[PDB]
């Protein structure tokens with residue numbers, strides 16, 4: 001398959017190879033804060049990243065992914081809306097060409113400068129590939145980025161991007177602590193949705209944190225120097241790698257907080 005974010009292969013085209021693009025639980029969505037209902041039955045989220053073991057960073061021609069060892073319960077997400085244990089496999093971001101767009105989820109139609117996705121799979125399904133055959137196979141923790149002060153825990157990521165400029169390039173990225181990417185509060189919204197890139201599979205319990213992290217203009221500027229293209233192809237800056245909000249259909253967004 002041959003998909004991207006431009007006019008000729010972007011989100012409006014995806015449904016041809018991936019008909020689920022027009023499905024009943026697609027992501028992202030707009031989070032209308034006045035329709036999301038506080039659910040007192042939701043447990044606190046448990047983010048257990050102490051033993052996280054990062055492996056590599058990769059430019060896949062769409063975004064960059066930091067990949068983890070998911071063989072054992074090293075870095076897991078539990079609680080909140082989730083039954084059982086979900087293992088961290090990778091994180092990546094979506095961002096804009098300018099600060100007024102870049103997020104996938106929106107909050108009362110507000111677009112943030114970027115959005116971080118920490119992707120986890122349900123350990124009752126044994127591996128990630130099996131998990132994406134299940135409606136509760138994945139849990140993605142989404143975190144908005146706004147431009148302000150630098151996020152120190154992001155800097156190691158920023159510092160390596162020069163080495164993975166183009167599609168297919170990777171670099172060692174062991175000993176990275178994803179706890180440094182989290183805001184103070186774990187207040188969240190949650191709803192059932194999908195992967196936001198092809199193959200757009202409808203497997204995801206979304207957990208979107210209310211509090212954005214702040215990153216510096218210099219940090220996001222370095223994201224925007226990456227390339228979608230491979231080396232030796234015309235340069236196309238990796239910006240605006242976000243899918244717009246999709247129809248909510250018959251879904252409810254729940255809030256963990258009043």
Ligand code: MMC
Nearest residue numbers: 133134202203
């Ligand atoms: C069914 Hg994913």
Ligand SMILES: [Zn+2]
Nearest residue numbers: 092094117196
């Ligand atoms: Zn994503």
